[PDB]
C-alpha cells in the first residue's frame, strides 16, 4: 500500500524561497518510488516541475529544487515570482503494483500583489432578451486583488435577492481576478423600477453602477 | 515540437461509451508507456490507467477495474480508453500522459477533453447581444449551454485584444451561462466590425451573432 | 553516441568544504545518469544512481541535481573518507560509456620540492643500459615540470615519470624522472642537469651532475 | 550477501584468446542483467561489455573499442558468466570487473546503475618471461636529508616488495610505481631519507622480493666514493 499528503495551502512573498513537503505513508514499504513534482496553472494542462528527487526538465527555471528526506520529499522554490501562483501536486510510482497515486496539492499563494479596485460593467437587458420576456441584467467585476468581492442587486433603492447568480472568483491571465453576476428579472419587472444598480464590495470600498429602466 | 491531442468527450447519459483516443506525434509510440489522468472539477488529478510499449501490460486504477479497457495502436499511432458503466460521479477532463523510458514521471500532458454524465440534454446557447451602452466595452451573452465548453470568438476570430471572456456560470436551474465582452474605442464604435461566433461543441450548434450599437 | 565531459579533473579540498563536480554531455540524457566513487585501489561503488537518487549503502552528505546537459555531484560536509575518484556514467542508451573520472586531493601549504640527482651506477654502467634518476621529494600540488638537460641542451621522448599517491602523513606527493641511455649516449655526455619547474621553487631548480665526477 | 567473484586472468600473449569466468552468489541470475567494466592500469573505467536477462530479448552488445573481438555469455543453473577475448592487443592489459545492472523498478529492461562489484582480476598482455628483477644502488652523494634508493630494472609480471633495513625503516620510505618501459619490463625505485650524520653511521641495506622469479637481491648501499 502507499498514500500521499499535501499541505492544504502555502504562502510566502515574492523574494523568497519556500517547501512544500509531500508526506508518504506506507506498511512494510520495502517497495521502489519514483517521485514527481507537477505544476497546475488554473484551468490548464499540468506540466513537470521535478523528477526523481533533484532532475529538472529541460526547458523550466533553475529556481526549482527538490529534496528527499526519509520519506517525506520536498519542492523549493527560489526566487518566488508572481508566475508561479499555481497548485503544485506530487506523484509516487510504484514499479511493483505499478500504479502512480497522487496527492491533494498545494495552492503556491504569494502576497507581493497591490490592492486594486474592481472594475464593474453594467449591461441593460438585451433589446433580443427583451422580446424574449426575461431581462437578465449582467455585471462584470474585472481586475480586483484579493479575489472576495461581494455583489448586491437594488431595484427601486431597495435591495433585491431573488434571481441573482454570482460567480466564484477566477484567476485571470493577467494576474487578477474577475467575477461574474446575472439578474434574472420578468420582462414586466425590468419596466417595473425606475433604475436598478449593482453595488460591489471587493475590500472594503462599494462601486456602485447604475441602469435604468429607461434604456429606450 | 511533440504534441499530444485527445478526442472524444461530450455529454454521455449514464451507462455510455464514450472511446476517447489520444493522437501523439514527434515521439516513437511503440517504445513509451501512455497513461491516462483524471481530474474532477475543483479536485485534484488521479491516475486512470496505463498501457506499456508492447502492450498486453494493463493496469488500472481501484476505482475502475472492470469498466476501463485500454488499447495501444502502434500502426495508426494513437491510443484508445474505453469506458463502460460510467457513474455519475466519473466527470472529469481526461489527460493523455506519455511515461519516459526510465519510467516514473509524466514527461508530456495532453491539452485534456470533458466528459461529463448527466440525464440534462444538450441546450444550445442561445446568444444575446450587450451592446454598448475613448474606449467602450460590449459583447454577447449566452444563456442555457449544458454542457461546457463554449467557444465566443469576436470578429471572426481575428480580434484578440480587448476581449475578456468571463468565466461560465453555473445557473440554478441546471444550464449554464457565459459572457464576453470587447473594449473597442469610442471614435471607433461607428466603424468597427463587431460580430460574434458562438460553437457549442456539445449540441454543435455554430451560431453567427450580430451586435450593434444602440 | 553519447559523449561525455567530465569538469574539473582534479579537485582540492580539505575537510568542511561543498565540492562540486560537473557531467555534461552533449546529448540531453533526461536521468540516467549514475555517480560511481572509487577508492584508489578498491573496487568502484555506485553513489547516485539517478541523477539525484541515493543508494542505501551511501551517506546523507552527498547530493545530486540535474537537468539535460548538467549534472551535478554536491558534497556538503568532506568527510575523510570521500578523498577518492569520481565518475559519471551514461543511461539513456548503449553504449553506457564511462566518464573520463575527477580526483578529490587533499589541499595543504605549498610546499616546494627537494631535487635530488641520482648519477648513474657503476654495477649498470657495464651493463649496458645507464640510467640517471631525478627525485622529487615533498611536493604540492601535483604539477611539476622535469626537464632533462644533457650538454646544457634539453631533451626529450626518452624520460618515464612516476608519481606517488598523496603521502597519509605529511600530505605530499613524490616524483620519479628516469632517463635511460644506451652505453654509448650513457659515455657521449658531459654534464647531466635535472631542472624542476614547480610553483613552490622560485626559479628552475637545476641539479646537475659532471658526468665522470 | 551479494557476491560477484571474478576467475581467470593472468599473462597472455597479444593475438591469443582468453576467457574469464564471473560466479554470483545471493541473487538469481535469470533475471539479473549483467556487465563487464575494464580498468586500464593508471587510466579511467570503461565499459567492455552488457548481458541482459533471458525474459529482455536476451541481447548481447559491446562497446565499440572491443566490438568484434569480445563476446559475453551467460549460463543458467550454473550462476555464471563467460567473457571472451580474440586477437588481444597489447593495449588490453587492464583489471576486468563484473557488475550486476540494477533494473529501475524490480523489474524492466532499462537500468540505471551498476550497483554491486566484484574485486576484478587482472589481465596482463606482454611477451617478456618472468626476468627477475636488476637492483641497481642510487647512492647519496649530496654535500641535511639525502637520499639512498634502490632502482630495480627488468621485471616481470608486476609487483615486488622493497624493504628498508630487512623492514625496519618504514618511516620516509617512498616506493614509487611500476613503470612500463618501452623494451617491455617494469621499472620501480625505493628511495629513502637519513640523516647526513646517519648516512655515513648505520647501513643501509634494501631487500627486493620478486615472488614471480622468486628472486631475493641484497643489496648494500654505500656512499660512492
Known amino acids: 500500500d502507499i498514500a500521499l499528503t499535501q499541505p492544504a495551502s502555502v504562502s510566502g512573498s515574492p523574494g523568497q524561497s519556500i517547501t512544500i513537503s509531500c508526506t508518504g505513508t506506507?506498511?512494510?514499504?520495502?517497495?521502489?518510488?519514483?517521485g514527481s513534482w507537477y505544476q497546475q496553472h488554473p484551468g490548464k494542462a499540468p506540466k513537470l516541475m521535478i523528477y526523481?528527487?533533484?532532475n529538472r526538465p529541460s526547458g523550466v527555471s533553475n529556481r526549482f529544487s527538490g529534496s528527499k528526506s526519509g520519506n517525506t520529499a520536498s519542492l523549493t522554490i527560489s526566487g518566488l515570482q508572481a508566475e508561479d501562483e499555481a497548485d503544485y501536486y506530487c506523484?509516487?510510482?510504484?514499479?511493483?503494483?505499478?500504479?502512480?497515486?497522487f496527492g491533494g496539492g498545494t495552492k503556491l499563494t504569494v502576497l507581493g500583489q497591490p490592492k486594486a479596485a474592481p472594475s464593474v460593467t453594467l449591461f441593460p437587458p438585451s433589446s433580443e432578451e427583451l422580446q424574449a420576456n426575461k431581462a437578465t441584467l449582467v455585471c462584470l467585476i474585472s481586475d480586483f486583488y484579493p479575489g472576495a468581492v461581494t455583489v448586491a442587486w437594488k431595484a427601486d433603492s431597495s435591495p433585491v435577492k431573488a434571481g441573482v447568480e454570482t460567480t466564484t472568483p477566477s484567476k485571470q491571465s493577467n494576474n487578477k481576478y474577475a467575477a461574474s453576476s446575472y439578474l434574472s428579472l420578468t420582462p414586466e419587472q425590468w419596466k417595473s423600477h425606475r433604475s436598478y444598480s449593482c453595488q460591489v464590495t471587493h475590500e472594503g470600498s462599494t462601486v456602485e453602477k447604475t441602469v435604468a429602466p429607461t434604456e429606450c | 515540437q511533440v504534441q499530444l491531442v485527445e478526442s472524444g468527450g461530450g455529454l454521455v447519459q449514464p451507462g455510455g461509451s464514450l472511446r476517447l483516443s489520444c493522437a501523439a506525434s514527434?515521439?516513437?509510440?511503440?517504445?513509451?508507456?501512455m497513461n491516462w489522468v483524471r481530474q474532477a472539477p475543483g479536485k485534484g488529478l488521479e491516475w486512470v490507467s496505463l498501457?506499456?510499449?508492447?502492450?498486453?501490460?494493463?493496469y488500472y486504477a481501484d476505482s475502475v477495474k472492470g469498466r476501463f479497457t485500454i488499447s495501444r495502436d502502434n500502426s495508426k499511432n494513437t491510443l484508445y480508453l474505453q469506458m463502460n458503466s460510467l457513474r455519475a460521479e466519473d466527470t472529469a477532463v481526461y489527460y493523455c500522459?506519455?511515461?519516459?523510458?526510465?519510467?516514473?514521471?509524466?514527461?508530456?500532458w495532453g491539452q485534456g477533453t470533458l466528459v461529463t454524465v448527466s440525464s440534462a440534454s444538450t441546450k444550445g446557447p442561445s446568444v444575446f447581444p450587450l451592446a454598448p451602452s475613448g474606449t467602450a466595452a460590449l459583447g454577447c451573452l449566452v444563456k442555457d449551454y449544458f454542457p461546457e465548453p463554449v467557444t465566443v470568438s469576436w470578429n471572426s476570430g481575428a480580434l484578440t485584444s480587448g476581449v475578456h471572456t468571463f468565466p461560465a456560470v453555473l445557473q440554478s436551474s441546471g444550464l449554464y451561462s457565459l459572457s464576453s465582452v470587447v473594449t473597442v474605442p469610442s471614435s471607433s464604435l461607428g466603424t468597427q466590425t463587431y460580430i460574434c461566433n458562438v460553437n457549442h461543441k456539445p449540441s454543435n450548434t455554430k451560431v453567427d451573432k450580430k451586435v450593434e450599437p444602440k | 553516441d553519447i559523449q561525455m565531459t567530465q569538469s574539473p579533473s582534479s579537485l582540492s579540498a580539505s575537510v568542511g568544504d561543498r565540492v562540486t563536480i560537473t557531467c555534461r554531455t552533449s546529448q540531453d540524457v533526461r536521468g540516467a545518469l549514475a555517480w560511481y566513487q572509487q577508492k584508489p585501489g578498491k573496487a568502484p561503488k555506485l553513489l547516485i544512481f539517478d541523477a539525484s537518487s541515493l543508494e542505501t549503502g551511501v551517506p546523507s552528505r552527498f547530493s545530486g541535481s540535474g537537468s539535460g546537459t548538467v549534472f551535478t555531484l554536491t558534497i556538503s560536509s568532506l568527510q575523510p573518507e570521500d578523498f577518492a575518484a569520481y565518475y559519471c556514467q551514461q543511461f539513456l542508451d548503449f553504449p553506457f560509456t564511462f566518464g573520463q573520472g575527477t580526483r578529490l586531493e587533499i589541499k595543504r601549504t605549498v610546499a616546494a620540492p627537494s631535487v635530488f640527482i641520482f648519477p648513474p651506477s657503476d654495477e649498470q654502467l657495464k651493463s649496458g643500459t645507464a640510467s640517471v634518476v631525478c627525485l622529487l621529494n615533498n611536493f604540492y600540488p601535483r604539477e611539476a615540470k622535469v626537464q632533462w638537460k644533457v650538454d646544457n641542451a634539453l631533451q626529450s621522448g626518452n624520460s618515464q615519470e612516476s608519481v606517488t599517491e598523496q603521502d597519509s602523513k605529511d600530505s605530499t606527493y613524490s616524483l620519479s624522472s628516469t632517463l635511460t641511455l644506451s652505453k654509448a649516449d650513457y659515455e657521449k655526455h658531459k654534464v647531466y642537469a635535472c631542472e624542476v619547474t614547480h610553483q613552490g621553487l622560485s626559479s628552475p631548480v637545476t641539479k646537475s651532475f659532471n658526468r665522470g665526477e | 550477501?551479494?557476491?560477484?567473484?571474478?576467475?581467470?586472468?593472468?599473462?597472455?600473449?597479444?593475438?591469443?584468446?582468453?576467457?574469464?569466468?564471473?560466479?554470483?552468489?545471493?541473487?538469481?541470475?535469470?533475471?539479473?542483467?549483467?556487465?563487464?567494466?575494464?580498468?586500464?592500469?593508471?587510466?579511467?573505467?570503461?565499459?567492455?561489455?552488457?548481458?541482459?536477462?533471458?525474459?529482455?530479448?536476451?541481447?548481447?552488445?559491446?562497446?565499440?573499442?572491443?566490438?568484434?573481438?569480445?563476446?559475453?555469455?551467460?549460463?543458467?543453473?550454473?550462476?555464471?558468466?563467460?567473457?571472451?577475448?580474440?586477437?588481444?592487443?597489447?593495449?588490453?592489459?587492464?583489471?576486468?570487473?563484473?557488475?550486476?545492472?540494477?533494473?529501475?523498478?524490480?523489474?524492466?529492461?532499462?537500468?540505471?546503475?551498476?550497483?554491486?562489484?566484484?574485486?576484478?582480476?587482472?589481465?596482463?598482455?606482454?611477451?617478456?618471461?618472468?626476468?627477475?628483477?636488476?637492483?641497481?644502488?642510487?647512492?647519496?652523494?649530496?654535500?641535511?636529508?639525502?637520499?639512498?634508493?634502490?632502482?630495480?630494472?627488468?621485471?616481470?609480471?608486476?609487483?615486488?616488495?622493497?624493504?628498508?633495513?630487512?623492514?625496519?625503516?618504514?618511516?620516509?620510505?617512498?616506493?614509487?610505481?611500476?613503470?612500463?618501459?618501452?623494451?617491455?619490463?617494469?621499472?620501480?625505485?625505493?628511495?629513502?631519507?637519513?640523516?647526513?650524520?646517519?648516512?655515513?653511521?648505520?647501513?643501509?641495506?634494501?631487500?627486493?622480493?620478486?615472488?614471480?622469479?622468486?628472486?631475493?637481491?641484497?643489496?648494500?648501499?654505500?656512499?660512492?666514493?
Open positions: 500522459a506519455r511515461f519516459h523510458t526510465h519510467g516514473g514521471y509524466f514527461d508530456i
Open positions: 514527434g515521439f516513437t509510440f511503440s517504445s513509451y508507456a
Open positions: 498501457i506499456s510499449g508492447s502492450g498486453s501490460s494493463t
Open positions: 506506507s506498511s512494510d514499504i520495502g517497495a521502489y518510488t519514483y
Open positions: 526523481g528527487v533533484n
Open positions: 506523484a509516487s510510482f510504484d514499479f511493483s503494483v505499478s500504479g502512480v497515486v
